[PDB]
Write a protein that binds this ligand. Structure first.
Ligand SMILES: CCCCCCCCCCCCCCCCCC(=O)OC[C@H](COP(=O)([O-])OCC(O)COP(=O)([O-])OC[C@@H](COC(=O)CCCCCCCCCCCCCCCCC)OC(=O)CCCCCCCCCCCCCCCCC)OC(=O)CCCCCCCCCCCCCCCCC
Ligand code: SF4
Ligand code: SF4
Ligand SMILES: [Zn+2]
Lengths: 49, 159, 115, 96, 45, 95, 209, 176, 115
């Protein structure tokens, strides 16, 4: 059942990244698929995960 | 190449954490090492040493018993044991041929004498024997690493 | 010798199945060559001493394994190899003739090494 | 303080400023003459004059081992303010 | 405060394996030849 | 940069070993990177008494090379006593 | 112990090496000039040049000497002495593990006989000396230049040779090739004046005159 | 002590010869490596997403040189020229002077980064911790002149990477 | 003092002989090194460079020095013949990129401080 579990997690990350638009933006710009906790934000506009 | 080069990068991390540069340390100076190790370095060395043998043998299985690694390498370019030492050959080049000689044991500099270890001594003097000697030297290096890791004394770093 | 040892361990030389007579003949030859060498030379004294000692022990003890032990020269093959080298050395410097005094002194201060 | 040259260049804390002709100014066209604004000459002057009341005063520059080597300046001359050569803080007797 | 630095734990360290633990796997040569020949024979049938 | 048990059993069988005991990865087991300030120890000659450098200098206690023979019945002597033979490996004499 | 910083002193090796030094001095009085053993248990033998082949052979062949390993071969240029160049042979024993050093002297022109036969490792080392100090070696099998660039000049390790050399090379489009030009540094090597004018070691003081 | 590496000669019974013939004919060690590499294929790929993720470093990391300054803002360099006498590549050049205030600061302090070999000798030589090497390594430039730093550039480096250098020194001065 | 050891040649005559076939080899070499290395040098202006280099060390009179120049030219000959040398090193003798250097004192004074 870990296969359907990882399928569910893969469909969960598309929700974690602010929906389809945010997910596609992250995939195309940052070459990343995973979502981490926002540990901080600098003045210039970079999110630290 | 790449499988062991990840571990080599892990070595470079230790090099960076002790001296300050991952490759060119400038660490070991006359009168002892430059400065003490950072806290927690020994534990990370311990974990790496635990994990290393399981990939050393992994490299072995790919190369040691392979047909074409041996065939390209076994018994090509023999070097005679007598003709080896006159030619000024040294290190594994000697040990590959068969002379039982190693400065770490016969002329022990620093604390190499208190460290117990066997050396790999070659059989046929060929390319393959030297390669096997290098790998067995890996493993004896791991054993030496364990020994020095367990028994580092309290003291200063420079004279 | 029982089962003759397969390999000495050094690939540069093989096993001599009859080593005792080899020790004997090479030692006798180099003793002859030293007999050539004039008496006053210290080389003849030292080398005749060590070689007659070696010949005595090799002709005394006929077990090869103990022969290496009291010969402190490893396997008998590298021992007869070194004996051949000693023969060669004595023969080669027979006509080099080093027993003569020094050819000449070094020029003035040629060895002091604070500059 | 940083001031502009007659040509327009920003003078440095050392006083460097390329003159009128000074052919070696093409290096700065389409670029900038990098000058640091935090002048060390004046950033030490506005610091208050410490009023510690003893004849001879120790100074390490703050931070203990992170500061400069410990120097003992003499708060003896009544007509001026003693200062550590390394850091530059002006030490003075509290008007005796 | 007592002097402290990077030191091994008081119980030393765990053993570090260095022996070649290259695994052994595979049927007997007779078994391999037998299974190959049996697959062949089924194919020809 | 852990995995599925279906893949976990596939890689182990293909690799013929239990690699989960230690991966080439390195997880939280690493040493912390905010270690407390270490109080470094001192050397032997740190006392304030009987530390006279005269009885401790190493460079000053070096004599010139001892001259043996110059251009201006003893038996035969070897440079070193003959080196002994090493022992076979008790653990793995032959690989 | 009482001396935790000073290196340990091994007098047994010192006496034993001195005994072997007297041995080798007695065996070959023709070429040997002066044998001495350093404080740190390292023996050096100063021989006449004509003994490059004989002495080495005696050290390579003799049963009681047994040195077959050419650790390195080096020249040490010193312009002060009459024969400026001095050549050092470093030998290591196997049966009687130890390090011996034999030292000879030659000037720029007086050739020194090439070992090669005594130690076939010397060959490349040999070439280096010729390509690095100007010390030509008699009947060396191939004494071609070994290290420096093609068509080079001089012998750089000579102490008179400047640090920066004489000529660099760089691209030239006018001729479409790398060309060699006389030296013109962008910043000159600052030669610091170290070696404080106060005597360091009273033991090694030069006698007056 | 020593171990012989390859003396394990094979036996010659029917079972052993059959096994060796099978291994030679029915390629087995070939398949062994072919399956090991498969195990490495299904594993977790070791790869760090640069520049989004950077490699681990240490507080001792030697990088871009920079000239720090005291908390008061005054530059720590008293131009003792120890760092110039120490740099093995002679990449450091200082000219000193009695300043208007008096404190002997550098009229010129330039480090030739193309001559520098990034050893950290200058910082350990500095008696006031003026010169240091910041954690920055991201200064790959386009022109050779861009690399040749100046006193003002070093001051700007010390004023940009400053919280970094202060934090690293606070975490490392006890070791050194 | 005055007595010294030779390299090969005994007297000026035999070293004079060695430079003879050194020039022999250089003559027979120049055309086919021009051909092989694709030189921009011409045959005549190849030979005259050899002649001028041979004339450059005209002042030498010590024998041993002459053996040294002849063996160094021998090494040069090997470097050229079997293509170990490269075209740029061959051009190195011809000073193309090197600007002409004045000779008269007046031009030296005009240029800068130099004897
Ligand atoms: C044969 C192939 C059958 C289909 C693929 C099955 C598969 O490998 O699923 C992954 C899944 C887990 O793989 P893993 O490498 O162990 O994962 C480790 C981490 O959990 C991995 O953790 P994670 O967080 O990286 O997991 C998320 C990841 C995991 O990957 C997926 O979920 C891929 C499936 C689509 C979503 O998905 C993504 O990252 C989303 C992007 C997917 C990229 C495009 C994938 C295309 C798949 C094929 C489409 C049709 C053609 O596979 C299994 O559990 C075994 C499935 C065996 C199927 C055999 C069928 C015959
Ligand atoms: S690291 Fe600093 S002190 Fe060392 S050579 Fe480079 S610039 Fe000079
Ligand atoms: S060592 Fe430090 S104080 Fe001295 S000149 Fe260099 S940077 Fe300035
Ligand atoms: Zn101060």
């Amino acid at each position: 059942m870990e296969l359907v579990q990882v399928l569910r997690r893969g469909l969960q990350q598309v929700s974690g990244h602010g929906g389809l638009r945010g997910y596609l933006r992250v995939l195309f710009r940052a070459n990343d698929v995973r979502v981490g906790t926002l540990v901080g934000e600098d003045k210039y506009g970079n999110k630290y995960y | 190449f790449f499988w062991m080069f990840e571990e080599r990068e892990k070595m470079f991390e230790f090099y960076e954490r002790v001296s300050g540069a991952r490759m060119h340390a400038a660490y070991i100076r006359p009168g002892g090492v430059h400065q003490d190790l950072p806290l927690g370095l020994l534990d990370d060395i311990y974990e790496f040493s635990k994990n290393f043998s399981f990939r050393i043998d992994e490299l072995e299985e790919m190369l040691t018993n392979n047909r074409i690694w041996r065939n390209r390498t076994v018994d090509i370019g023999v070097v005679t044991a007598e003709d080896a030492l006159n030619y000024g050959f040294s290190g594994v080049m000697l040990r590959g041929s068969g002379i039982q000689w190693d400065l770490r044991k016969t002329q022990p500099y620093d604390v190499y004498d208190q460290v117990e270890f066997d050396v790999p001594i070659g059989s046929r003097g060929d390319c393959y024997d030297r390669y096997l000697c290098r790998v067995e030297e890996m493993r004896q290096s791991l054993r030496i690493i364990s020994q020095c890791l367990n028994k580092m004394p309290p003291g200063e770093i420079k004279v | 010798a029982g089962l003759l040892k397969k390999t000495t361990g050094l690939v540069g030389l093989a096993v001599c199945e009859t080593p005792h007579e080899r020790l004997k003949i090479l030692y006798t030859k180099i003793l002859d060559v030293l007999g050539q060498i004039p008496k006053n030379a210290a080389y003849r004294k030292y080398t005749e001493q060590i070689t007659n000692e070696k010949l005595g022990m090799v002709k005394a003890e006929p077990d090869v394994k103990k022969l290496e032990e009291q010969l402190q020269g490893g396997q008998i093959e590298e021992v007869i190899l070194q004996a051949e080298n000693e023969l060669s050395l004595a023969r080669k410097m027979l006509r080099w003739k080093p027993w003569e005094p020094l050819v000449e002194e070094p020029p003035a201060n040629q060895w002091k090494w604070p500059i | 303080g940083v001031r502009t040259s007659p040509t327009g260049e920003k003078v440095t804390h050392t006083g460097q400023a390329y003159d009128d002709g000074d052919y070696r100014r093409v290096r700065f066209s389409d670029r900038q003459k990098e000058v640091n604004e935090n002048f060390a000459i004046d950033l030490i002057a506005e610091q208050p004059v410490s009023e510690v009341g003893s004849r001879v005063i120790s100074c390490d520059g703050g931070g203990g081992a992170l500061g400069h080597p410990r120097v003992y300046i003499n708060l003896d001359k009544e007509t001026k303010t003693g200062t550590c050569g390394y850091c530059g803080l002006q030490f003075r007797q509290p008007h005796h | 405060s007592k002097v402290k630095q990077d030191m091994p734990p008081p119980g030393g360290y765990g053993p570090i394996d260095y022996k070649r633990n290259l695994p052994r796997r595979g049927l007997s040569g007779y078994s391999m030849f037998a299974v190959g020949i049996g697959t062949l024979l089924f194919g020809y049938w | 940069a852990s995995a599925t048990r279906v893949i976990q059993l596939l890689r182990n069988w293909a690799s013929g070993r239990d690699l989960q005991a230690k991966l080439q990865l390195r997880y939280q087991e690493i040493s912390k990177r905010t270690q407390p300030p270490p109080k470094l120890p001192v050397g032997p000659s740190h006392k304030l008494s009987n530390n006279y450098y005269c009885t401790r200098d190493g460079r000053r206690e070096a004599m010139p090379p001892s001259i043996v023979m110059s251009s201006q019945e003893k038996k035969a002597v070897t440079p070193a006593p003959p080196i002994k033979r090493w022992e076979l490996s008790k653990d793995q004499p032959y690989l | 112990d009482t001396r935790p910083t000073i290196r340990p002193r091994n007098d047994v090796v010192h006496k034993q090496l001195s005994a072997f030094g007297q041995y080798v001095a007695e065996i070959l009085p023709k070429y040997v000039q002066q044998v001495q053993v350093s404080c740190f248990n390292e023996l050096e033998i100063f021989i006449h040049p004509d003994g490059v082949i004989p002495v080495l052979t005696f050290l390579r062949d003799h049963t009681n000497a047994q040195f077959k390993s050419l650790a390195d071969l080096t020249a040490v240029d010193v312009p002060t002495r009459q024969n400026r160049f001095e050549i050092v042979y470093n030998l290591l024993s196997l049966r009687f593990n130890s390090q011996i050093r034999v030292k000879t002297y030659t000037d720029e022109l007086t050739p020194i006989e090439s070992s090669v036969t005594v130690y076939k490792a010397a060959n490349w080392y040999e070439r280096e000396i010729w390509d690095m100090f100007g010390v030509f070696f008699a009947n060396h099998p191939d004494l071609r230049r070994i290290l420096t660039g093609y068509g080079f000049e001089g012998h750089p390790f000579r102490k008179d040779f400047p640090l920066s050399g004489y000529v660099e090379l760089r691209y030239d489009d006018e001729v479409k090739r790398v060309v060699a030009e006389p030296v013109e540094l962008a910043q000159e090597f600052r030669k610091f004046d170290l070696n404080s004018p106060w005597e360091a070691f009273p033991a090694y003081r030069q006698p007056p005159e | 002590t020593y171990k012989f590496v390859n003396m394990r000669e094979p036996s010659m019974d029917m079972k052993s010869v059959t096994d060796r013939a099978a291994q030679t004919l029915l390629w087995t060690e070939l398949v062994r490596g072919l399956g090991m590499t498969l195990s490495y294929l299904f594993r977790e790929p070791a790869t760090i997403n640069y520049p989004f993720e950077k490699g681990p470093l240490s507080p001792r990391f030697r990088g871009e040189h920079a000239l720090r300054r005291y908390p008061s803002g005054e530059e720590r360099c008293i131009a003792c020229k120890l760092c110039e006498a120490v740099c093995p590549a002679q990449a450091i050049t200082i000219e000193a002077e009695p300043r208007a205030d008096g404190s002997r600061r550098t009229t010129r302090y330039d480090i030739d980064m193309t001559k520098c070999i990034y050893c950290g000798f200058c910082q350990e030589a500095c008696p006031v911790d003026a010169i240091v090497e910041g954690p920055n390594f991201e200064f790959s430039t386009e022109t050779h002149e861009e690399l040749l730093y100046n006193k003002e550039k070093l001051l700007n480096n010390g004023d940009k990477w400053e919280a970094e250098i202060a934090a690293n020194i606070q975490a490392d001065y006890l070791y050194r | 003092g005055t007595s010294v050891k030779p390299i090969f040649s005994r007297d000026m005559n035999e070293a004079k002989r060695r430079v003879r076939e050194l020039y022999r080899a250089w003559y027979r070499e120049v055309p086919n090194t021009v051909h092989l290395f694709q030189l921009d040098i011409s045959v005549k202006q190849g030979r005259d460079k050899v002649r001028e280099m041979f004339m450059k060390n005209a002042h030498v009179t010590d024998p041993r020095v002459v053996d040294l120049l002849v063996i160094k030219g021998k090494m040069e000959l090997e470097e050229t013949i079997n293509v170990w040398k490269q075209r740029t090193h061959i051009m190195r003798f011809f000073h193309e990129t090197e600007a002409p250097r004045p000779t008269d004192f007046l031009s030296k004074f005009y240029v800068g401080h130099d004897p």
